[PDB]
Structure 1
Amino acid sequence: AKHHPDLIFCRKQAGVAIGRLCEKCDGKCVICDSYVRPCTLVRICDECNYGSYQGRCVICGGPGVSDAYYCKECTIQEKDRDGCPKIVNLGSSKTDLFYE
């Protein structure tokens, strides 16, 4: 995300699998991470959609509910035509909070 600067994206080739967002993060854009003007569906790679990882949230990794989208401001900057935006690592937040 933009808030947690240590989160890294997957960035491999985007397949045909449509991204999903959890119930806690519905309406969030994936890159600019806002709520308004969703314009373009999320296509995620086949390694980040395999088996146990199907229909899972792009950001949280929770169980997905609705489809994921990019903003218009991510679309017209063509930040959707890079790799798949599946946030891979879980780092330094929601880990120490689990230990707290």
Structure 2
Amino acid sequence: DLIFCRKQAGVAIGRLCEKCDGKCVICDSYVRPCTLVRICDECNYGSYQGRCVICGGPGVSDAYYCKECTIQEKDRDGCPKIVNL
């Protein structure tokens, strides 16, 4: 049930927690963070305002795509928030 949200991303910036701080959301790499992550409006609302996009804990820093995912334009899909059903 690890599925990405894949909704139209807005102006909200994705956040990472203390455990996931250096990670890439899509491929889980740690090398060369390149592009700032954007999330949709339903992922950024109320109690969901600041939360890790990978796990859902309290965010502390910005989420980034890696250079490898940026080269393949994998930052052009929807909201990359991990959502469980």
Deviation readout 1:9-40 (Å, 9 max, x if unpaired): 00000100000001111100011111110000
**Cα distance, 1:47 vs. partner?**
0.4
* Identity across the alignment (%): 100
Helix, strand or coil for the counterpart of 1:64? coil
RMSD: 0.6
> How many pairs does the alignment contain?
84
Larger RCO: Structure 1 or Structure 2 (Cα < 8 Å, ≥ 6 residues apart)?
Answer: 2
Higher strand share: 2
In 2: Cα distance, 1:13 partner to 1:33 partner: 22
Deviation readout 1:33-74 (Å, 9 max, x if unpaired): 111100000000000111100111101100000100000000
In 1: Cα distance, 2:70 partner to 2:61 partner: 19
Match of 2:11 in 1: 16
TM-score of the superposed pair, with normalisation by structure 1: 0.82
In 1: Cα distance, 2:51 partner to 2:26 partner: 17
Instruction: Specify every segment of 5 or more residues in structure 1 that has no aligned partner in the other structure, as ranges.
Output: 1-5, 90-100
Helix, strand or coil for the counterpart of 1:34? coil
Higher helix share: 2
